Structure 1
Amino acid sequence: YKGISLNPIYAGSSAVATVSENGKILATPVLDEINIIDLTPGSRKILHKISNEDEQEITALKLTPDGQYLTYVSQAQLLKIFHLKTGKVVRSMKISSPSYILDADSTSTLLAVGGTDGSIIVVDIENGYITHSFKGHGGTISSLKFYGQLNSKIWLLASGDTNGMVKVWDLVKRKCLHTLQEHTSAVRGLDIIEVLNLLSGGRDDIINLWDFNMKKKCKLL
């Protein structure tokens, strides 16, 4: 008999699905593979399933707001960055900490990974080499966030801890700029908006807003 098999899309592992700025793309973890699917009005289809290994499940995955790269962390402490044009894994490197939060810049140049030990590393996307590694706070990372303009010279990297803490760093100077202890629990989500104002969603009950400067001017808005 003829048979058409319909397969699941977002099944198994608890990692967020990601899309680019357009709805044309989506990336999803099934238990070991990352199905990429195009959504177009009407003609929604699949691109290609990547089949790294059936043993380890995908821990996290991120697709840049332009559909050019896919960065995914598996159960072994390594990140695999994979080209989307050719459909080929370009690089893969161990990180020695099980990463769970992946945040990419709006521009496709930087992407940062963060795990449980508290140390985070931010890698360049086009050339897979890590610029700098932050020791960070001693708590497990719960979120990160980027602030970068398209043509500027200042880049901010904010980390929301399992502790009620957000550490914002300069990137062009790599310094612990501001350590704001305000929540009581994990910082599930983060955000940075233009003037500076910073928002932080602490998972207990709180949405903090900080007026902020490059200099020591940072209080509770």
Structure 2
Amino acid sequence: QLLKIFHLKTGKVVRSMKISSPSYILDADSTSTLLAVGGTDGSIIVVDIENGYITHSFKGHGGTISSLKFYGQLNSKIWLLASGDTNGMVKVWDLVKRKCLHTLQEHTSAVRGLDIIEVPPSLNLLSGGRDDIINLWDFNMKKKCKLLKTLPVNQQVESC
């Protein structure tokens, strides 16, 4: 049972949806009006929060779904989604074409803590895990590659 409270003087339940699986990870955008939530099966719904209902489904995946992240700069045309996992993988979706950009099966435990930025579309991302590997990627828009691994000795949760 997903709900949203508008934080302003109207503190009423604005929208309420019936999501499929009991979920345990949410992220809103760096901007407003995008809320992504993925259940404990493979389903990552994303919701425009103003007129609150489902704007993307994203069946897509496998296993219960770990942490995820947006890519948001105000007034852009890119709008990616990060989509970690429990069985170690990162499957990046966009939101402007509803397509799996790149499938990446490389990890060994739950992919907690991944982050996306661009440095001059370059768009380097970085995905930690309950395994000790942070494993940043170059992540071009068409076809992507890998760079260094640089291995912290932790159990990294939310590697910002």
TM category, shorter: 0.7 to 0.9
Q: 1:202 to 1:89 in 2, by over 3 A?
A: same
- What is the aligned length? 145
Match of 2:125 among 157, 174, 198: 198
Distance 2:79 2:110 in 1: 24
Q: Residue deviations 1:139-175, cap 9 Å, x none?
A: 1001111001111111110101001100101110010
1:105 Cα shift? 0.3
Partner residue in 2 for 1:212 = 139
Shift, 1:136, TM fit: 2.4
* 1:169 alignment counterpart: 93
* Kept in 2: contact 1:113–1:122 (CA 8 A): yes
CA distance in 1, matches of 2:71, 2:103: 16
CA-based RMSD: 1.4
Does the Cα contact within 8 Å between 1:210 and 1:218 map onto a contact in 2?
yes
More strand by share: 1
Q: CA deviation at 1:123?
A: 0.3
SS at match of 1:145: coil
Residue-by-residue CA offset, 1:184-203 (whole Å, 9 max, x unaligned): 00011111121221100111
Q: Which runs of 5+ in 1 are unaligned?
A: 1-76
TM-score by length of 2: 0.85
Q: CA deviation at 1:81?
A: 4.4
SS of equivalent to 2:57: strand
Contact 2:5 2:12 in 1 (8 A): no
- The structure, 1 or 2, with the larger RCO (C-alpha pairs under 8 Å, 6+ apart) is 2
- Indicate the SS of the match to 1:116: coil
Runs ≥4 in structure 1, deviation > 2 angstroms?
77-85, 217-221
Q: Does the 8 Å CA contact 1:81/1:92 hold for their aligned counterparts?
A: no
What is the deviation of 1:108? 0.8
Contact 2:20 2:39 in 1 (8 A): no
**TM-score after normalising by structure 1:** 0.62
Partner of 1:38: none
Shift of 1:86: 1.5
Alpha carbons 2:92, 2:100 under 8 Å: kept: yes
Question: Which structure has the greater CA radius of gyration?
Answer: 1
Q: Distance in 2 between matches of 1:110 and 1:80?
A: 12
Report the Cα distance in structure 2 between the residues aligned to 1:127 and 1:146, rounded to whole angstroms. Answer: 19
Assess, with a 3 A threshold, how the Cα gap between structure 1 residues 177 and 150 changes in structure 2: closer, same or farther: same
User: Matched residues, percent identical?
Assistant: 100
* Residues 101 and 84 (structure 1), Cα distance of their counterparts in 2 relative to 1, 3 Å cut: farther
Deviation at 1:216, TM superposition (A): 1.1
* Contact 1:116-1:140 at 8 Å conserved across structures: yes
Q: Secondary structure at the match of 1:95?
A: coil
- Alignment match, 1:109: 33
Aligned to 2:7: 83
CA distance in 1 between counterparts of 2:35 and 2:129 reads 23
Shift of residue 83 of structure 1? 4.2
Maintained 8 Å contact 1:200/1:207: yes
